[PDB]
Amino acid sequence: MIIMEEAKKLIIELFSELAKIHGLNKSVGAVYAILYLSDKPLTISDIMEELKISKGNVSMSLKKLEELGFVRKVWIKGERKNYYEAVDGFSSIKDIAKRKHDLIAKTYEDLKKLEEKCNEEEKEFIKQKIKGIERMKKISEKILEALNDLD
Amino acid sequence: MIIMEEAKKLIIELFSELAKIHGLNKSVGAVYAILYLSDKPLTISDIMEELKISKGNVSMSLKKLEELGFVRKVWIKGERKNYYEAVDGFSSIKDIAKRKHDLIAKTYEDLKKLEEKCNEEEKEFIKQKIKGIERMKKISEKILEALNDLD
């Protein structure tokens, strides 16, 4: 079962990439890979040995993931260090897909209130850019929609 | 027609916040809103005054947008400088939804193959971290699906 070092390698590379895709550092994604596979919390030093990277590259990557919400800090009785663990991957996505949806909609609504007053022949001037923000809404309704079809 | 400035400020505020949720700098989203709202390619300097930020905050934000592929350099005849312009928004999201899907897909394919060999009673051991990566597949299929339901 050298198999498992292989399944590990794959997963870690998947996440590294994806992260490079969302405009983030490969590590951030590399570190979440480690945690995603871990069945127990891991400290900074732990993660450093599993990926072999400075203490800082690990700390930042962790910092990015706490911002995002995929990772949270964990406290172990009798322990001085700060542990970490991967939040339920998919649930944390739902949350994001929903914040992004309430934000985009709130904007599309406010943008509508300004089109209330801005009317007549000018009401049409705004319709260019509002129709882009109006798509942004139809997209997160489904990306949300599709998300509440898997639970 | 201050309204416009008002709508401007909405859209800029909308994009600043979607960059801070995707773990990016608020600038990275503000910048996109300038090029998003503009009808012509701008220069780094043009945007600075548009958002009143440093020549570094703009360069920061613009290299990332190019990375993520929402903005692309543009050249003007008789102009020593560089110009930037947002790319076709939603098109640039179709492309990202596929890369992710093709990375996820592949890996999920490759994870099976290791489960081909790794079998019997252990074939069952792999099934934990796999059903996670299998979910991510069904998700990028719909957010993909959904995106190919708008054109």
UniProtKB/Swiss-Prot annotation, chains A, B:
Domain HTH arsR-type stretches: 7-106
DNA-binding region positions on the chain: 44-68
Leader sequence segment: none
Record's keyword annotation contains Repressor: no
Pfam families in UniProt: HTH_5
Cited SUPFAM superfamilies: Winged helix' DNA-binding domain (SSF46785)
InterPro entries: ArsR-like_HTH, HTH-GbsR_regulator, HTH_ArsR_DNA-bd_dom, MJ1563, WH-like_DNA-bd_sf, WH_DNA-bd_sf
Gene Ontology terms for molecular function: DNA binding; DNA-binding transcription factor activity
Keywords: DNA-binding, Transcription, Transcription regulation
Family: Belongs to the GbsR family.
Protein name: Putative HTH-type transcriptional regulator MJ1563
